[PDB]
Amino acid sequence: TTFKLIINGKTLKGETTTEAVDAATAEKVLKQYINDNGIDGEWTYDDATKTWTVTE
């Protein structure tokens, strides 16, 4: 199973997944990826397939 996150930036968007012990550890690395796009605001987890979110 791989974690997933969708970029909800006003100009930058898309999706991304990572592999780690838990989504908590991955999400920290996914935040670092968001640090480059500059799209950090409010994230949301989903029990569907361990996905995530990040709206600017």
Residue 5 is which amino acid? L
Q: Pairing state of beta strands 13-18 and 3-8?
A: antiparallel
- Residue 54: how many other CB atoms lie within 10 Å: 24
Method used for this model?
A: NMR
Say if residues 27 and 40 touch (Cβ distance below 8 Å). no
Kindly report the number of other CB atoms within 10 A of residue 6's CB atom. Answer: 16
Q: Which sequence spans correspond to the domains of the chain?
A: 1-56
Three-state SS string over the chain comes to CCEEEEEECCCCEEEEEECCCCHHHHHHHHHHHHHHHCCCCECCCECCCCECEEEC
The burial class, CB within 10 Å (0-12 / 13-18 / 19+), for 30 is: buried
Report the top-level CATH class of 1-56: alpha beta
- Count of CB atoms within 10 A of residue 17's CB? 15
